[PDB]
Amino acid sequence: SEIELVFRPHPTLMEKAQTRYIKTSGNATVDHLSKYLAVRLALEELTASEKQYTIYIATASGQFTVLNGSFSLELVSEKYWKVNKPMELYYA
Ligand SMILES: [Cl-]
């Protein structure tokens, strides 16, 4: 299962540039994603590549659910995001 994601800095937990659009496998884990992100941010906002990030998913009621790092993206999508839109993911 291919998964599209849009990543944004958590709007209150990060100090107020980019939106990042990613397509990947539903088999990738949330942890893999946070490690990928640590590598991206170390270079793109320049070890810092070792820094850890928490991943949140936007909820319909305007909240943010922390995603367990062991969950596959396919499981994330089943649990929290069934809809036909890229997953709206936030990091801090
Ligand atoms: Cl945007």
| Domain limits, the chain | 1-92
Chain centre to alpha carbon of residue 22: 10
Single-letter code of the amino acid located at 31: D
CA atoms of 66 and 55, how far apart (whole Å): 6
CA atoms of 29 and 91, how far apart (whole Å): 15
The rounded Å distance from CA 72 to ligand 1 centre is 25
Residue 80, CB-side half-sphere exposure with 13 Å CA sphere: 22
CA atoms of 56 and 43, how far apart (whole Å): 22
The rounded Å distance from CA 16 to ligand 1 centre is 13
In order of 3, 10, 21, 54, 79, the CA distances from 37 in angstroms are 16, 13, 12, 10, 22
- Phi-psi map region of 63: left, alpha, beta (phi>0 left; psi -120 to 50 alpha): beta
The topology under which CATH files domain 1-92 is: Ubiquitin-like (UB roll) (3.10.20)
A 10 A CB-CB count for 26 gives 14
Final resolution, Å: 2.0
**Which experimental approach was used here?**
X-ray
**Concatenated DSSP letters for 17-80?**
---EEEEEETTSBHHHHHHHHHHHHHHHT--GGG----EEEE-TTS-EEEPPTTSBHHHHHHHH
The rounded Å distance from CA 43 to ligand 1 centre is 21
A 10 A CB-CB count for 52 gives 10
The rounded Å distance from CA 19 to ligand 1 centre is 6
